[PDB]
């Protein structure tokens, strides 16, 4: 997925990067400037993106949850309202 | 929201810009870069975004999924620990 | 952690200078681009950063669900199988 620790280093580093940018504009400084933060962008998606299959699953899980509150006799005046809440939820973390 | 595969997709492209770039440095590679960074930020924020909305009705069905529990006798001893978790949780979610 | 207000505004702002950058390449709109980009990235490694750490909180609250579940008398049949989503769940949210 993605390694949060070297994003999160790496940006502080991104950041030395554009001062010196700033102090001295340069084709050099410019394009160092475009690696670090290309290098970024590539841990930035994939944490994006592992975290929405995360959260399907903590979804999937509540749905479970309900279904094991069901079995020993909770309200459905309850329940079915976290269903349908649940079933959107879910359908707006996937894609396809 | 966010589409997940067309950031992933352009991120792989913005990867390709790069090569480029570095192989061969210039005004127009730089440009490009820039402009496929920008659209990946637009897709890379709200995508961040959208999952802390997302996050927000997690929490607050953890919260139903409580009232589902007391109702059926569940020993207040772990529901309450659950509530103040929760109520500070979704404070962390929610802006303004 | 970060303020999405902020961040979302600061990427319309990128935007405009991207806009600006294209129809008129120069050293100033390639630096004033990339600083944007920057600072944005500082906020975008935060919010991706801090979800992943209430995600985390998120499933230990579930674990906490599954124990109320237990206490009260649900057939282990179903919480056990939650008990090893969670476990590896919460695996690939934390770091070190």
């Not at 475009?34 to 944490?47: C, D, L, M, P, S």
Request: proline share 1%; no cysteine.
């Amino acid at each position: 997925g993605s390694h949060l620790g070297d994003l999160k280093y790496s940006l502080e580093r991104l950041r030395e990067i554009l001062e010196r940018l700033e102090e001295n504009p340069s084709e050099k400084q410019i394009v160092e400037a475009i690696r670090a933060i290309v290098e970024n962008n590539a841990q930035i998606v994939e944490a994006i993106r592992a975290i929405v299959e995360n959260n399907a699953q903590i979804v999937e899980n509540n749905r479970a949850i309900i279904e094991a509150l069901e079995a020993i006799g909770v309200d459905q005046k309850i329940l079915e309202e976290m269903k349908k809440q649940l079933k959107d939820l879910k359908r707006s973390l996937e894609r396809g």
